[PDB]
Design an enzyme around this catalytic site. Structure first.
Site, mmCIF file in Angstrom:
data_model
loop_
_atom_site.group_PDB
_atom_site.id
_atom_site.type_symbol
_atom_site.label_atom_id
_atom_site.label_comp_id
_atom_site.label_asym_id
_atom_site.label_seq_id
_atom_site.Cartn_x
_atom_site.Cartn_y
_atom_site.Cartn_z
ATOM 1 N N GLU A 73 -9.750 39.788 20.580
ATOM 2 C CA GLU A 73 -8.383 40.568 20.745
ATOM 3 C C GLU A 73 -7.552 39.694 21.594
ATOM 4 O OE1 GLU A 73 -8.297 44.538 23.457
ATOM 5 O OE2 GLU A 73 -7.960 42.854 24.933
ATOM 6 N N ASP A 134 -9.215 44.492 15.454
ATOM 7 C CA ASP A 134 -7.815 44.194 16.050
ATOM 8 C C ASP A 134 -7.717 42.592 16.184
ATOM 9 O OD1 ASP A 134 -9.626 44.851 17.977
ATOM 10 O OD2 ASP A 134 -7.783 45.262 19.393
#
Length: 387
Positions: A73, A134
């Site tokens: 991330e 993500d």
């Protein structure tokens, strides 16, 4: 050799910027914020990977016996930030390529076209960890930006790397048979577990524009359907969504989902990122469903705080009751970003800018604050397949 040097200071149709200061002031605030962010968080001290860069998270505890230094991330946040600051930071391309080296060296143990979610300074960790959706979304999107910034004829073929990561990585492992996005490449292809902060509508648009694979549009449309199906039942007044969403029909995840927190059923630290990811779709691609979602959340938070951004707290139940206690940028700044699609929000946007522009706290809030500031000043430009 930058084709989109900072500051691109673009003007998206139908969106306002803070207007009580000049554009040169907005750009200067972003440059200073970036220089401070880079000094504190950008690292290149992996004894196990000379030349590799990463973004220093906090991360309490061990991860499979390793000491976690950063995550995929943060790698994705850093890679987006780095390409956008090219033209100001003369070392941007070297940093970007070094972040990419880390991303591909710490490849996922499941799908090797993705990044394993933990960066730790051990050769044993390189290829040990599975992915998180993500992180790979932001990394792959950053490659599209790199292609448009520097071109793909150099050491790294950014466009081909992007296309491979998007198609052999994210579509293969994370796009589910129900046209959602699962939690990572360890999750099943039929999973109905999803994290709405992964619903990066504007990235998915770019994936479509650079691959021509209509899967991405099918996922976008379905996720808007899901958002509405969820919110009409579970957040009819606030428009908020929970950190995790499960099942069909979609519903809030249980508490303690993935052992992350007691508030995984609520609008908590994962979901705080959602309003930026949604609003960018209206700004960059004109998607009206994004304006609807954004205006509902923006109006709710403005009324909730009586127009004072410093009164935002770090977490809310879906009905709007406070969980948190204090204003942190990962919550504040996306609420400001959600407000940019209506001109009658000008005062609130200006107040939000004043709150966020120098606000330095810790890795998660600072990194997302910088992405938000880049976007709300027009300095996150749109990658387009040509001219």
């Amino acid at each position: 050799k930058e084709m989109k040097p900072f500051p691109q200071q673009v003007n998206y149709a139908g969106v306002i910027k803070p207007n009580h200061v000049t554009q040169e002031s907005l750009n200067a605030s972003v440059r200073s914020y970036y220089d401070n962010w880079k000094k504190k968080y950008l690292k290149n001290d992996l004894s196990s990977l000379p030349g590799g860069y990463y973004v220093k998270g906090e991360i309490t505890g061990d991860a499979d016996g390793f000491k976690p230094l950063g995550t995929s991330e943060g790698q994705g946040y850093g890679m987006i930030i780095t390409v956008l600051m090219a033209g100001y930071d003369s070392n941007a391309q070297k940093i970007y390529d070094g972040l990419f080296k880390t991303a591909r060296t710490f490849k996922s143990s499941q799908n090797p076209n993705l990044m394993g979610w933990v960066v730790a300074d051990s050769k044993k960790a390189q290829g040990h960890f599975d992915s998180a959706t993500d992180g790979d979304l932001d990394i792959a999107y950053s490659l599209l930006l790199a292609h448009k910034q520097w071109g793909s004829n150099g050491t790294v073929n950014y466009l081909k790397e992007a296309q491979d990561m998007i198609t052999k990585g994210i579509k293969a492992s994370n796009v589910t048979n129900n046209n959602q996005l699962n939690l990572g490449d360890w999750d099943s292809k039929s999973s109905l577990d999803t994290r709405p902060s992964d619903w990066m509508m504007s990235h998915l648009r770019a994936f479509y524009e650079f691959t021509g694979d209509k899967t991405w549009l099918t996922v976008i449309n379905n996720l808007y359907d899901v958002y509405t199906q969820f919110s009409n039942k579970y957040s009819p007044n606030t428009g908020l969504i929970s950190d995790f969403v499960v099942k069909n029909p979609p519903q809030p995840a249980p508490k303690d989902f993935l052992d992350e927190s007691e508030y995984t059923n609520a609008y908590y630290y994962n979901a705080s990122r959602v309003p930026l990811r949604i609003v960018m779709d209206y700004a960059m691609y004109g998607e009206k469903r994004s304006k609807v979602i954004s205006d509902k959340v923006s109006s709710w938070i403005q009324n909730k705080t009586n127009g004072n951004p410093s009164k935002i707290v770090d977490g809310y139940q879906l009905n709007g009751s406070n969980i948190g206690s204090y204003p942190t940028a990962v919550f504040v700044s996306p609420f400001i970003a959600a407000s940019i699609t209506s001109s009658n929000n000008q005062k609130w946007v200006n107040s939000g800018w004043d709150w966020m522009k120098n606000k330095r706290e810790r890795y998660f809030s600072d990194s997302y604050n910088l992405l938000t500031m880049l976007f709300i000043t027009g300095n996150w430009w749109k990658p387009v397949p040509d001219d």
